[PDB]
Design an enzyme around this catalytic site. Structure first.
Site, PDB file in Angstrom:
ATOM      1  N   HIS A 133       0.818  -1.223   0.000  1.00 13.92           N
ATOM      2  CA  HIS A 133       0.000   0.000   0.000  1.00 13.92           C
ATOM      3  C   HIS A 133       0.853   1.275   0.000  1.00 13.92           C
ATOM      4  O   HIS A 133       0.378   2.308  -0.392  1.00 13.92           O
ATOM      5  CB  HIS A 133      -1.036  -0.002   1.143  1.00 13.92           C
ATOM      6  CG  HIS A 133      -0.515   0.466   2.464  1.00 13.92           C
ATOM      7  ND1 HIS A 133      -0.204  -0.399   3.493  1.00 13.92           N
ATOM      8  CD2 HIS A 133      -0.285   1.716   2.939  1.00 13.92           C
ATOM      9  CE1 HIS A 133       0.219   0.292   4.534  1.00 13.92           C
ATOM     10  NE2 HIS A 133       0.179   1.577   4.225  1.00 13.92           N
TER      11      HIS A 133
ATOM     12  N   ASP B  93       1.014   1.487  19.871  1.00  8.44           N
ATOM     13  CA  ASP B  93       0.658   1.021  18.526  1.00  8.44           C
ATOM     14  C   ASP B  93       1.687   1.496  17.504  1.00  8.44           C
ATOM     15  O   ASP B  93       2.521   2.362  17.790  1.00  8.44           O
ATOM     16  CB  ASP B  93      -0.744   1.524  18.141  1.00  8.44           C
ATOM     17  CG  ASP B  93      -1.424   0.663  17.094  1.00  8.44           C
ATOM     18  OD1 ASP B  93      -0.954  -0.469  16.832  1.00  8.44           O
ATOM     19  OD2 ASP B  93      -2.452   1.126  16.515  1.00  8.44           O
TER      20      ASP B  93
ATOM     21  N   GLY C 165       2.917   6.313   8.721  1.00  4.00           N
ATOM     22  CA  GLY C 165       4.332   6.574   8.520  1.00  4.00           C
ATOM     23  C   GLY C 165       5.232   5.407   8.901  1.00  4.00           C
ATOM     24  O   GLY C 165       6.375   5.351   8.458  1.00  4.00           O
TER      25      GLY C 165
ATOM     26  N   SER D 288       4.196   2.304   8.341  1.00  2.00           N
ATOM     27  CA  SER D 288       3.804   1.341   7.332  1.00  2.00           C
ATOM     28  C   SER D 288       5.004   0.833   6.581  1.00  2.00           C
ATOM     29  O   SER D 288       5.891   1.617   6.224  1.00  2.00           O
ATOM     30  CB  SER D 288       2.873   1.987   6.303  1.00  2.00           C
ATOM     31  OG  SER D 288       1.567   2.104   6.790  1.00  2.00           O
ATOM     32  N   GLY D 289       5.030  -0.486   6.358  1.00  2.00           N
ATOM     33  CA  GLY D 289       6.109  -1.135   5.625  1.00  2.00           C
ATOM     34  C   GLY D 289       7.275  -1.572   6.513  1.00  2.00           C
ATOM     35  O   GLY D 289       8.113  -2.371   6.097  1.00  2.00           O
TER      36      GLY D 289
HETATM   37  N1  LIG Z   1      -1.986   0.051  13.958  1.00  2.48           N
HETATM   38  C1  LIG Z   1      -1.804   0.781  12.814  1.00  2.48           C
HETATM   39  N2  LIG Z   1      -2.456   1.872  12.498  1.00  2.48           N
HETATM   40  C2  LIG Z   1      -2.003   2.322  11.303  1.00  2.48           C
HETATM   41  C3  LIG Z   1      -2.331   3.415  10.527  1.00  2.48           C
HETATM   42  C4  LIG Z   1      -1.675   3.608   9.328  1.00  2.48           C
HETATM   43  C5  LIG Z   1      -0.697   2.718   8.894  1.00  2.48           C
HETATM   44  C6  LIG Z   1      -0.358   1.626   9.666  1.00  2.48           C
HETATM   45  C7  LIG Z   1      -1.008   1.431  10.866  1.00  2.48           C
HETATM   46  N3  LIG Z   1      -0.909   0.460  11.842  1.00  2.48           N
END
Ligand SMILES: Nc1nc2ccccc2[nH]1
Ligand SMILES: Nc1nc2ccccc2[nH]1
Ligand SMILES: Nc1nc2ccccc2[nH]1
Ligand SMILES: Nc1nc2ccccc2[nH]1
Ligand SMILES: [Ca+2]
Ligand SMILES: [Cl-]
Ligand SMILES: [Cl-]
Lengths: 250, 58
Positions: free
Chosen positions: A41, A182, A186, A188-189
């Site tokens: 994504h 969490d 940002g 992501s990946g």
């Molecule tokens: N838990 C969580 N929330 C997110 C929001 C955007 C990208 C990755 C993510 N992982």
């Protein structure tokens, strides 16, 4: 990352920062000298594929200290089953244009065998997730690399404890449902890395969630074990013209 | 020994073989010791290890 701490410089040495036109895009995981794993994504809105850069050895984004190594991304490989704008099959394999040089600050994470990952690593409760993403939901991103320890849930228990996409067999949940801790936008990946008997392994990819640290929800991670053979086969293949490549999955 | 229990005693990867046979293996950049289970680095920067911490306890 929400609710974690700074990863001390050199302690997250497989962490990749992906840039587009110099701007922060996503994280990724180095798995050998020319290959990086990230999330499909991350590339949904790329316009010029030839301005994607991978940075290794990065830690503090406000300074240059000389341990950083930048590389052009020559190929982004995404499975045929991934559909832009959706959550399932959220994985990308990136070929760098030139190998990075392994150093104290740049080291690959082990891509495990499938059986080992399924039979052993999948039962290690806690794993580390890392990135330069948002420190808070609706907040600023980090200047120093952050890391967070999160527990993994069996999918039945994730669905029971959560309170919207399905959690498919190509995913798993990890973290906390109390809004304290969490991964976030940002991140992501980036890597979900699992320790077993003195060595670290790639078990997940920061993928999605309902907002960040949303009470009643857990982080969602691409289940890398499903993709091991797919990845290994692509790493033995010759490059093809054109940055984006869709490759059959399984 | 069987790979589904306790990783077959292997430090890293495990293969079951026909009979009561098991083989442990190690990732590239590591070799298997004579105990048949442990993996030792064969390069300066093997995957999954953190040099500043490995040095911090060498
Ligand atoms: N838990 C969580 N929330 C997110 C929001 C955007 C990208 C990755 C993510 N992982
Ligand atoms: N930018 C982008 N990413 C894609 C992933 C799959 C198919 C088409 C795509 N276009
Ligand atoms: N492959 C290999 N294994 C080694 C162990 C100690 C010193 C040098 C070495 N090279
Ligand atoms: N510099 C160096 N070379 C090595 C080879 C094998 C194991 C450890 C090593 N450290
Ligand atoms: Ca820096
Ligand atoms: Cl080929
Ligand atoms: Cl192109």
């Amino acid at each position: 990352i929400v609710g974690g701490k700074v990863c001390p410089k050199g302690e997250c040495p497989w962490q990749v920062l992906l840039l587009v036109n110099g701007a922060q895009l996503c994280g990724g995981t180095l798995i050998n000298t020319i290959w990086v794993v990230s999330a499909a994504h991350c590339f949904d809105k790329i316009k010029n594929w030839r301005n994607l850069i991978a940075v290794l050895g990065e830690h503090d984004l406000s300074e240059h200290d000389g341990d950083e190594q930048s590389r052009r991304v020559a190929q982004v490989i995404i499975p045929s089953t991934y559909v832009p704008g959706t959550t399932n099959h959220d994985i990308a394999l990136l070929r760098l244009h030139q190998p990075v040089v392994l150093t104290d600050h740049v080291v690959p994470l082990c891509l495990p065998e499938r059986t080992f990952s399924e039979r052993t690593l999948a039962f290690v409760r806690f794993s580390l997730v890392s990135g330069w993403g948002q420190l808070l939901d609706r907040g600023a991103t980090a200047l120093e690399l952050m890391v967070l320890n999160v527990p993994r849930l069996m999918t039945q228990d994730c669905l029971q404890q959560s309170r919207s996409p399905n959690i498919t067999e190509y995913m798993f949940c990890a973290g906390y449902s109390d809004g304290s801790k969490d991964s976030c936008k940002g991140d992501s990946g980036g890597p979900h890395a699992t320790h077993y008997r003195g060595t670290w392994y790639l078990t997940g990819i920061v993928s999605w969630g309902q907002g960040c640290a949303t009470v009643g929800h857990f982080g969602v991670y691409t289940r890398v074990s499903q993709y091991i053979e797919w990845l290994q086969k692509l790493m033995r293949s010759e490059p093809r013209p054109g940055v984006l490549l869709r490759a059959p999955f399984p | 020994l069987i790979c589904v229990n306790e990783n077959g005693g292997c430090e890293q990867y495990c293969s079951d073989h026909t009979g009561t046979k098991r083989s442990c293996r190690c990732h590239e950049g590591y070799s298997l010791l004579a105990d048949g289970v442990s993996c030792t680095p064969t390069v300066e920067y093997p995957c999954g290890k953190i040099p500043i911490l490995e040095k911090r306890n060498a």
